[PDB]
Design a protein around this ligand. Structure first.
Ligand code: JQZ
Ligand code: JQZ
Ligand code: K
Ligand code: K
Ligand code: K
Ligand code: K
Ligand code: MN
Ligand code: MN
Lengths: 500, 500
């Protein structure tokens, strides 16, 4: 089965790419697995596969860390993400995001139901498993639980059956047969939960599938629109209908090749302690436990020699940066274009801890609008900050066509030199805020509201007559023939490979 | 003569350090020299010495580019600056800035007058030189003149004789015997010029010395206090009285080993076209000529085989970042401490195009102050933004003791995650602004006023009870014994030198 359609095949792909380290000696899921994975993420090393995990019993489970993190080389930096999508390993960020957006004006390709698959190779009923007896990792030393769920996909369906959502949201073990997790507005798992709560009749039928098709976990991490079933979006993107099998104990459908499947319910009434957790912005606040959603597990099914993917998240660079930031930026780019705003590209700079998005403006089109900074900032921020795609993003930086938004150094340069603090910015206090950012939920103001800004790093003449500067750099401040002579004589003179 | 006390010896030091490329084939001062130097600066290569400069006649002149720019290796990144100061080449930024501040509570060591020196080996009177006939560089293709002066020191004295200032300010050739240059408030060359203008009797006696003692060019680039003669500050810092010789045509005194000396006057009445220039923030605005100060040259003296230092400034990283930013930050650190503010360290991040300064706070001392963010932001910004040391800096970022301000990645992390836009910031519109930043002089508001901000990236409990988080990083989210085990087994498991 293709790497993008089967997690087991994805793992082989990373091996083939010389992008895997298999660790066959015993590794402790109590911090050691996640510490190794953390180090990998902070140094862009090869992904670790822990084949001998202390506590693994009857096939549950191995761990793969850092599934969507960065490679060291510039040429295949985003190769792990490309392997989620059938793209060449040298694919650019632009090409990855364009692939993730491609299904947005295609007909869905609904999934195909098949009678069985590898995820049914083993099963444990409610008398045979105990989640406290599995080798669930402690990922950070101050975490408030063992986070089984950092890279699986929650599956919930609207009461009326018309929308089945796939998404990543964290969850930790509560007891032998329950998890607790984050279920917060405006996320789709929350939106659907609300529907069931209003109906008031039953808990939400639920499944959590780990080690799903890589193209599916990518969509699970992207804010595609309300009401859109991720399975059909992934089908359209990949050009193939995804093969799903029915759960044993409910009527939801899971990828046939899922490594591990939990079946059960998400309560409409119960809560339990959740967190704290070492989160995407690089912090944990020890002891900050709050009540979270409570999930009951009724059944586990799993592949022979099951592998659990794990994100050891926190400071740069991991899945919470490469996927959350980048996929939100992609959706924001489309959202802006659909609102008739002249945006060509968007990216969440890693330097900003993916709290900013830089928006590249087609300034020819801007000039024809005959507008001003105040007006344009206001229009852009209203579109983005009033939409779910803008939830995680607290600063938008508008830049002209000379800036490559996928290059943080160039975004930082433009922001620092072209946006006058205060005057060239518009603050938004009456929009939903992202509480996980420390300055929100642990800050001086309302955890859930405001703290957003549009920072205009377009220069004045970009709105009127055109760019009126040249950079003081090698590229722009010397003629072509001179630059080429310098390059051609560089090593000859005594000064100092793409792939590496 | 020691490298820090003699430019010629500094050049030998760079050779010895394997940090020089000598180019003995003909190089054009029309863009080629500066393009090579630009490339060096953008790639942290070895400094170029152009020994065969097309147009050099009767000893005037060779060029050294990139004298204060960065080396490629992390271990001796700031080695060129260390060589300005007699420090080991592995000196940290903290050690360099501490050396530059050390003279601030020492008695000056006045200079020693000597009867002659290498700068008197050759001379040209007013009938023998023509500045348009020297190999003065065109540094950027759209510059409004040939910038002879990018790394020499202007020497002017107060009318009453009590203060002799040494500083770097750009100047370009106007005609056979004049320069034009930037002389702007609140700079000391401007302050002294004003004194002479008010007196109204004569033009300002002036000298411009190129290839001065490296310790002297460092102080020339630092905003040491009003009224303080740089020569005596450098004397105290180095522990040695600088040897100076009298000019031939005026009573000013120049370093004995100066490579090239211009003697003449800075007019109190005349101006001429100056600029545009490819400036520190990385831009040129072609055609933006304005009137600048006008200097008359009466005499040139110079060393045999004179070397002119040159800064090919613009985008990262050159002298305008490593020296302007860092030395301003040093002075701001002291200024804050002298105003009883609990600041331990300051640096201007290169990522900010040296328009920000990050201020590391001793949060134990902050807590004892029993204050709040609003109040503290206001106090810090009033101290810094009302002082000349804060002129070039438009954003101050307050960070707690866990942040290494000399590490831009960590400053960016703290700023992005700990400072809520708007609420955690105070804007300053009634302070002097830095017009060279594009968003000031080519922006939407007053070129000379406002556009400054204090951004508080201290978390709330840093003011009260103490830091209440741990980072989600390898360092902080795993116990010591586990971290060391991971490190010790890293290569054994299959994962991947200080000097490199
Ligand atoms: C990749 C990823 C992702 C994620 C995550 C992760 C990962 C790895 C972890 C590791 C697990 C971490 C965690 C966190 C932390 O950091 O902790 C987080 C946060 C983040 C943001 C926000 C809020 C939260 C999560 C949770 O928990 N919750 C939620 O909610 N979400 C989320 N995410 C996101 C998501 O996925 C999107 O958003 C879509 O989009 C969904 O879908 P829809 O359908 O709804 O649209 N998570
Ligand atoms: C290192 C260096 C330095 C500098 C410079 C340079 C260099 C290399 C060049 C290349 C030549 C460039 C240029 C510019 C541009 O960018 O163009 C500039 C600007 C900058 C800022 C500001 C304003 C301007 C200069 C001019 O021009 N002017 C002035 O004014 N200044 C200046 N600087 C600074 C200085 O030096 C300080 O500030 C002290 O401090 C002084 O002293 P006192 O005594 O007064 O204190 N410059
Ligand atoms: K999703
Ligand atoms: K602007
Ligand atoms: K100075
Ligand atoms: K703050
Ligand atoms: Mn969804
Ligand atoms: Mn001075």
């Amino acid at each position: 089965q293709p790497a993008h359609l089967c997690f087991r095949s994805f793992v082989e792909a990373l091996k083939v790419d010389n992008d895997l380290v298999e660790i066959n000696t015993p590794i402790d899921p109590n911090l050691e697995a996640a510490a190794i994975t953390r180090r990998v993420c902070e140094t862009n090393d090869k992904a670790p596969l822990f084949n001998n995990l202390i506590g693994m019993k009857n096939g549950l489970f191995r761990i793969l860390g850092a599934p969507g993190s960065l490679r060291k080389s510039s040429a295949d930096r985003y190769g792990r993400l490309a392997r989620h999508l059938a793209l060449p390993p040298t694919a650019s960020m632009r090409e990855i995001l364009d692939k993730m957006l491609s299904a947005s004006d295609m007909p869905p390709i609904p999934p195909t139901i098949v009678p069985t698959g590898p995820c049914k190779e083993n099963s444990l009923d409610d008398s045979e498993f105990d989640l406290t007896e599995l080798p669930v990792p402690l990922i950070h030393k101050s975490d408030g639980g063992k986070y089984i769920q950092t890279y699986g996909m929650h599956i919930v369906q609207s009461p009326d059956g018309t929308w089945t959502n796939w998404s990543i949201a964290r969850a930790m073990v509560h007891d032998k047969n329950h998890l607790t997790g984050l279920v917060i507005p405006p996320q789709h798992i929350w939106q659907i939960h609300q529907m069931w709560k209003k109906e008031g009749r039953s808990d939400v039928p639920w499944a959590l599938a780990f080690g799903v098709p890589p193209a599916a976990i990518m969509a699970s991490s992207m804010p595609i629109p309300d009401g859109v079933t991720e399975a059909g979006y992934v089908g359209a993107m990949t050009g193939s209908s995804l093969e799903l099998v029915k759960c044993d104990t409910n009527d939801l459908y899971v990828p046939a090749t899922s490594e591990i499947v939990l079946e059960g319910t998400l309560s409409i009434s119960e809560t339990g302690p959740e967190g704290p957790f070492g989160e995407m912005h690089g912090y944990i606040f020890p002891g900050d436990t709050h009540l979270g959603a409570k999930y009951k597990v009724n059944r586990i099914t799993y592949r022979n020699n099951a592998i659990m993917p794990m994100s050891s998240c926190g400071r740069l660079t991991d899945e919470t940066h490469t996927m959350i930031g980048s996929l939100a930026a992609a959706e924001i780019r489309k959202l802006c274009q659909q609102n008739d705003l002249p945006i060509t590209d968007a990216f969440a700079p890693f330097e900003s801890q993916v709290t900013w998005v830089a928006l590249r403006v087609d300034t020819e089109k801007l000039r024809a609008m005959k507008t001003t900074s105040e007006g344009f900032r206001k229009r852009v921020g209203d579109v983005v900050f009033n939409h779910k795609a803008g939830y995680t993003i607290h600063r938008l930086v508008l830049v002209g066509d000379d800036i490559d938004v996928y290059e943080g150094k160039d975004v930082l340069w433009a922001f620092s030199t072209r946006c006058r603090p205060g005057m060239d910015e518009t603050l938004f206090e009456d929009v939903r805020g992202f509480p996980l950012i420390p300055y929100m939920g642990h800050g001086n103001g309302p955890a859930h509201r405001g703290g957003k800004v549009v920072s205009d790093a377009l220069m004045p003449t970009e709105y009127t007559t055109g760019r009126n500067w040249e950079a003081a750099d090698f590229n722009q401040s010397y003629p072509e023939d001179l630059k080429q002579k310098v390059l051609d004589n560089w090593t000859k003179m005594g000064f100092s490979h793409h792939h590496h």
